[PDB]
Write a protein that binds this ligand. Structure first.
Ligand code: GDP
Length: 451
């Protein structure tokens, strides 16, 4: 027994909504007063609740999208002397006066502020700026950077340096990328090519505007409250201080007095210093800070977690550890057995036939999946890249695998309607990956012969 209006008062509904529901549920009412059976009592109560939760799912989409934007982190890669140390020096400069490092530094532009790494892994950089000297083109250190970088999922700009000089061939470079598959935006393609100098700092400016654009185009936004998290930039034994650990802040705000955990290493932030020279008791996301008070040396690209108490710190840091020691003995034996199978396991033939195919967003990035893969048939098995091409997949390919038994792997395109469909019904190892690595680590599974 209930009065439609009592129900909407109880639930926290008001009736306009309550009758509206019932007048989709399909249950008679003369007016808001008219009575209901409890079966009714809850027929809404249950059919009211699902929506009510369901809306609080959008709210979180409410917490999610409206979140403040956060400083873009650029890191820089390139060949030993193609202008990296030099262009960084240019970027640090501004507070002329306006210094021990924290692993990163800032440039504050009217358009935005950008973090640029100052280091010698967690995914620490939304972006990479391949430095290619205009003169000596693409030399091995340069390919390695792009490949590795493109596994990061890091967004890449190619910066050309040493152009003030009278012998740079900027085409030579643009071409060199082309043949590779990173084809300039200028040609009609998808790579970003910015002619720069590092001594008069021509191009620096834009490389500033460009990156910001890239930051506008993907709202890189971080919510200060969220459980605080970061990653480990650097770690040292400070001669006077003790254990000192450069961190960059990912989401969350870290406050001195916070308990923290970073792989096997734990502590209580006792202090935090920001590159300026001033102590902070808050670190917001995109904040490179020098943290003091840790009980070990942490390793770089370990995620910094916040913990409420220093006992949870110990538990996680030792939950992590006794798996690693657990590994170790594992090789502490594997290695005693196959380490010496043939010495260099050579007389041993080599033949294992691992076959796969690669379809991609771009060649600019298909020829990075391999570069990485190619270092990596270091096990008894040697893995075959059967056909490589760009794009979404083939049923034949689903058929191809059979002749093949090669597994089909993809990055930057998702499968199609029945290719997943024949893909699956068909006995074929199909994959879709977010990031090229998470394409790659998987490849490691495939050493164990897929059984
Ligand atoms: N001509 C010219 N040379 C440059 C410029 N910027 C840097 N270089 C040169 O690049 C070389 C390598 O710089 P360095 O920072 O030591 O190496 P990297 O950081 O590994 O690229 C230096 O010997 C400089 O002469 C530039 O704008 N023009």
């Amino acid at each position: 027994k209930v009065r439609i209006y009592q129900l909407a008062k109880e639930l926290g509904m008001e009736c306009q909504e309550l009758l509206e529901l019932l007048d989709q549920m399909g249950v008679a009412y003369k007016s808001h007063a008219s009575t209901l059976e409890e079966k009714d009592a809850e027929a809404v109560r249950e059919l009211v609740k699902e929506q009510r939760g369901l809306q609080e799912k959008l709210a979180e989409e409410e917490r999610r999208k409206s979140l403040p934007r956060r400083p873009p982190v650029v890191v820089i890669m390139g060949h030993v002397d193609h202008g990296k140390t030099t262009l960084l020096d240019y970027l640090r400069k501004s507070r002329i006066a306006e210094t021990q490092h924290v692993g990163a530094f800032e440039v504050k532009t009217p358009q935005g502020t950008v973090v640029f790494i100052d280091t010698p892994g967690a995914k620490v950089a939304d972006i990479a700026v391949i430095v290619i000297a205009a003169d000596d083109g693409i030399m091995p250190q340069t390919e390695e950077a792009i490949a590795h970088a493109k596994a990061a999922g890091a967004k890449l700009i190619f910066a050309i340096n040493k152009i003030d000089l009278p012998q740079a061939d900027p085409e030579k470079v643009k071409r060199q990328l082309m043949e590779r598959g990173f084809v300039p935006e200028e040609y009609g393609g998808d790579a970003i090519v910015i002619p720069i100098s590092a001594k008069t700092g021509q191009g620096v400016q834009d490389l500033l505007e460009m990156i910001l654009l890239l930051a506008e185009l993907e709202d890189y936004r971080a919510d200060p409250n969220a459980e605080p998290r970061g990653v480990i930039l650097e770690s040292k034994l400070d001669k006077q201080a003790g254990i000192i650990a450069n961190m960059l802040v990912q989401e969350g705000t870290f406050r001195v007095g916070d308990y923290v955990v970073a792989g096997e290493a734990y502590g209580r932030i006792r202090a935090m210093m920001d590159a300026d020279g001033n102590q902070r008791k808050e670190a917001g996301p995109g904040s490179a800070v020098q943290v003091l008070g840790f009980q070990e040396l942490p390793h770089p690209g370990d995620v910094v977690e916040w913990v409420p108490d220093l006992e949870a710190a110990k538990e996680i840091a030792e939950e992590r550890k006794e798996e690693r020691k657990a590994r170790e003995e594992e090789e502490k034996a594997r290695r005693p057995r196959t380490m010496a199978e043939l010495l260099r396991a050579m007389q041993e033939e080599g033949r294992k036939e691992l076959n796969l195919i690669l379809r991609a967003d771009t060649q600019g990035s298909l020829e990075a999946i391999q570069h990485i893969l190619a270092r990596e048939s270091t096990e008894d098995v040697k893995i075959n890249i059967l056909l490589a091409q760009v794009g979404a997949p083939t049923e034949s390919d689903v058929l191809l695998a059979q002749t093949a038994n090669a597994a089909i792997l993809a990055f930057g395109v998702n499968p199609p309607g029945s290719v997943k469909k024949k893909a699956e019904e068909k006995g074929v190892l199909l994959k879709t990956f977010r990031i090229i690595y998470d394409l790659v680590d998987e490849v490691r599974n495939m050493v164990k012969g897929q059984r």
